[PDB]
Symmetry: C3
Subunit: 306 residues, 3 copies
């Protein structure tokens, strides 16, 4: 069993400095030794260096860094595609969540029937026409879903992106901070999600059961786990850019990762939005990074009963 680890130190999907140090923080929290201990054969691609784009002016006087986000994701997609083709499950360390454009596009290149479990406080599904921030880390899903493309204009640097995945092939877990246009999109296209309220009602066990029934109930499919650290309650993951009270507990996050592992289908994992500079203390940064490692390790078989 082989795992590729890719550092994607990208910050231009949003405006807060420091998320580009996420990959180093996660590495320094002991990721590689944790993965080896589970028996993973590891290939470390290091931290990628993304080609900058000169004069990357705002798109439509609103969307920030469109060409840089587009080119960095193009280059990342190529690495992910290559790594999956050589048989690695792909761990990508962010960096802001706009990198999912690249990891999912690269993943889907030769696994077009993949499915997506998006663990996040946010739906990240604004389009360039609905985003009120202009930050591409809050729009990545809009570029990936086939049903949405008549409503998604073409951004400079984005022409290489072919929407691959159907709206029936992504399930959200942990939502609690959704813009009204995103809520409209989720309803209008019948995208399935389990908000914190649904977890409050159902419990995380039934949530995972219904997630896998929706996605792999009829056939086995490679799973793409896109895990935004801010799905966890801010008391557990303070060092992140958009913290929202009322998040997953530690045990709930582990349970999600455990069930991901238990399918046997995990093919790529994003761990994004760890920003150590937003911690008010070194300890706050380290617990956030330590939590990111716990998620990744549990997703590749670390158990709580030994």
């Amino acid at each position: 069993h082989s795992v590729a680890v890719i550092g994607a130190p990208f910050s231009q999907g949003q405006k807060r400095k420091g998320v580009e140090h996420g990959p180093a923080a996660i590495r320094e929290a002991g990721l590689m030794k944790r993965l080896s201990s589970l028996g993973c054969h590891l290939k470390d691609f290091g931290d990628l260096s993304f080609t900058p784009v000169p004069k990357d002016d705002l798109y439509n006087n609103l969307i920030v860094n469109p060409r840089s986000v587009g080119l960095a994701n193009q280059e990342l997609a190529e690495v992910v595609s290559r790594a999956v083709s050589d048989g690695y499950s792909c761990v990508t360390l962010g960096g802001d969540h706009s990198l999912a454009i690249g990891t999912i596009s690269g993943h889907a290149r030769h696994c077009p029937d993949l499915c997506v479990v998006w663990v996040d406080a946010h739906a990240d599904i604004n389009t360039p026409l609905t985003t009120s921030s202009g930050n591409l880390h809050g729009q990545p899903v809009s570029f990936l879903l086939r049903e949405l493309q008549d409503k998604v204009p073409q951004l400079p640097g984005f022409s290489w992106i072919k929407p691959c995945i159907s709206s029936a092939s992504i399930v959200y877990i942990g939502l609690r901070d959704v813009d009204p246009p995103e809520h409209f999109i989720l309803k209008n296209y019948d995208i399935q999600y389990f908000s914190m309220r649904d977890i409050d009602r159902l419990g995380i066990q039934k949530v995972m059961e219904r997630t896998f029934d929706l996605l792999i109930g009829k056939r086995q499919r490679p799973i793409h786990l896109s895990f935004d650290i801010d799905a966890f309650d801010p008391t557990l993951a303070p060092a992140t850019g958009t913290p929202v009270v009322g998040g997953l507990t530690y045990r709930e996050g582990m349970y999600i990762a455990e069930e991901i592992h238990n399918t046997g289908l995990l093919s790529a994992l994003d761990l994004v939005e760890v920003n150590p500079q937003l911690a008010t203390s070194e300890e706050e940064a380290k617990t956030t990074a330590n939590l990111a490692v716990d998620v990744i390790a549990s997703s590749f078989g670390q158990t709580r009963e030994g």
Copy 2:
């Protein structure tokens, strides 16, 4: 779709200074804008000034400030009754919980078939003969329940009170610090409650289902939500006079408010016992006040899924 906001900066139901700054603290945490954003048409009555009573000696060498508490609640009931009479859902910001004598009396004056959801670590149902503290914020329910009245002596300043609500019309949620005579009262009058232990067993979804079955399962009734901030765990609401370990989580609190909103029957709400002076830090004070705003906003339609 109209909401009145009444500040009741009362502290004489108990002995700790500062709870009279609850209303200002909750307002400064952004309450009015949050209510407006939901579509509430707002009438702000400001903070009331209550008439002092000269020589308000202890009653029976035990009950403190009886006439002041009686008169303040008489005046508050007057304001609540006119606001409900003019079509407003009434939000009253405390202040100690003795002001529920006034808000429920004033509410019932216009809506006599109301029912009460009392969210609290405490039962607040001591009578003047069972209280061991003498503080009227630990007795408000005893003055309101019709079946208890033969055991409730008449206090100076209380003769205006018409206790007509039945013991079958109030349900408690969150109990975990109950005096032995309060436990006797709850059992002897078959008053229904969901303690923290019941929530542990049933889960908050079934707690709310069973609460509404008891109160509105036979007919629609206006709902009075009386919410003591100390129902929440002290880690979440530290700035309060009688914190008790092992309380509601944030998510459980939001879920209660959400189900209150979902009935469509919320007619008045109390948010009581925020005392910002008991915070050990400005952070603890603001967290408690922000939590209070979250409870109120969720009770009037704020969702976690947008």
Copy 3:
């Protein structure tokens, strides 16, 4: 009902200084008054002074203080046996968990059909041949289970110990940090346990129901509750030697204890591994001690509804 309280200030089942002050910390947090208030008639045995053993060299160049742990547990077992013989429910305050060798042996002497509820982040079931630490507080169960005795070598100071419990007669709750050889032992001898993951799935009410079904579903048996304070999440019980993230909540711990009390069969209880010196602050030490008192008190009838 009569309760004996035995301080067992023992630290040589492990290497960290200060767990011998656990009994004094728990007493200072009000234990005796809490138990009296529940109506329990109290016999206080004080803190035992265990006989030292000169030249207590490592066994097999690994196992630390074997003769001291053997002899202290022999002396403790004698005291527990006498107290249980005299009709006391036995509360033993630790001290590290190697003292369960003594309390369970003494308890089993008069009550051979006793069953064991072991509440703990750890399984404590390494043998002298599987421990990687050499610390006897991580091995006590191996000396007590009949089915394991052909694989447990005899230690200096241990020859008095007769395995008294069958592997069907112990249930674990709270496991989350299990060594591979312990996991093998648990599965190979079909020892029943509820890990944190099981609690996440079932909820603590179902966990307790199944616990008692396994243990006393056929017949009434005296219950021995061996409660390692590190079963609780470290945010709640920080002053302990091997804290593990993702533990019991406060409410779950109270619920376990309440259900223990509700059987009416509690005959002895260990409250072990409070180490006040590992607190980074006086408050951290006191919160841990207060929690220990809450466990013991709820195990003997303290309720959350009064």
